[PDB]
Design a protein around this ligand. Structure first.
Ligand SMILES: Nc1cc(-c2ccc(Cl)cc2)n[nH]1
Length: 282
């Protein structure tokens, strides 16, 4: 079926939970043996969210190459994404090692450091220009260059230096600051505006490594971001845009990381975002 009228049909019939459970039942199951090794317990935020072995990002390190991060490679759309958990106190150095080694231009953050009175990720970037951060375990330096605070999101320019080679690179940090503590946004308008700002920066383009996107576990809000982006790109590429099937795209992405889209409300919000976005594109 088309999207917008499939949407109204699920609303009127109140069957979002059943649609979402079908997706959960059909989703791929692949091994995640490296994630479960005892030496990696303090590298995982949640025991039930792990990267598959076949798609995990490997650190270029012979001691321990593990990080909780997955490469989502979308062949027809010609887009790739790295989805990862919010960094932990003992993985902030690994996080920036990955950014460096994978040649990423942008980092997309969809959570606040504290939500619901608890810490959802480490404070992994500097908050003042004159107070830079040094990660001694991976030999990197990170400096805040500029910060632009808007009503729904903040953009930061960061300098990452490899202290071993003295090479430097500019990284863009796109921080969506207004996702509510509970539920999903009432309108997708600010989330779509944010997606377009990431696109306009070059951070999603083939001349760079894959964008790094995270929330707390790296599957819920993060899944919503890449699902909406990929569906909109396919609607532009194809002769028949109404042939884009959001459920089929989601199952393809779940071949590369488990659990993408965590609730039936997030699924409904993803439909809403693609529907409204397809009108603005034209
Ligand atoms: N004067 C000045 C420096 C910069 C700059 C420096 C370093 C990065 Cl990574 C990005 C921008 N903009 N303007």
């Amino acid at each position: 079926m088309e999207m917008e009228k499939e949407f109204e049909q699920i609303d009127k019939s109140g069957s979002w939970a059943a649609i979402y459970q079908d997706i959960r039942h059909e989703a791929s199951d692949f091994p995640s043996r490296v994630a479960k090794l005892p030496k990696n317990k303090n590298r995982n935020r949640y025991r039930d969210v792990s990267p598959f072995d076949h798609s995990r990002i490997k650190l270029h390190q012979e001691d321990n190459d593990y990080i909780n991060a997955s490469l989502i490679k979308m062949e027809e759309a010609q887009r790739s994404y790295i989805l990862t958990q919010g960094p932990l106190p003992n993985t902030v150095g690994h996080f920036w090692e990955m950014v460096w080694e994978q040649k990423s231009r942008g980092v997309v953050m969809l959570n606040r450091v504290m939500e619901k009175g608890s810490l959802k990720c480490a404070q992994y970037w500097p908050q003042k220009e004159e107070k830079e951060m040094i990660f001694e375990d991976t030999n990197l330096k990170l400096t805040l260059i500029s910060e632009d605070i808007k009503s729904y999101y903040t953009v930061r320019q960061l300098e990452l230096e490899n202290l071993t080679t003295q090479e430097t690179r500019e990284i863009l940090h796109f921080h969506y600051t207004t996702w509510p503590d509970f539920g999903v946004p009432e309108s997708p308008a600010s989330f779509l505006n944010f997606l377009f700002k990431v696109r306009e920066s070059g951070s999603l383009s083939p001349e760079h490594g894959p964008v790094v996107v995270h929330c707390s576990a790296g599957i819920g809000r993060s899944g919503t971001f890449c699902l909406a982006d990929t569906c909109l790109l396919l609607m532009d590429k194809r002769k028949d845009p109404s042939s884009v099937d959001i459920k089929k795209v989601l199952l393809e992405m779940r071949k590369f990381r488990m659990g993408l889209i965590q609730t039936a409300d997030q699924l409904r919000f993803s439909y809403l975002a693609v529907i409204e976005g397809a009108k603005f594109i034209m």
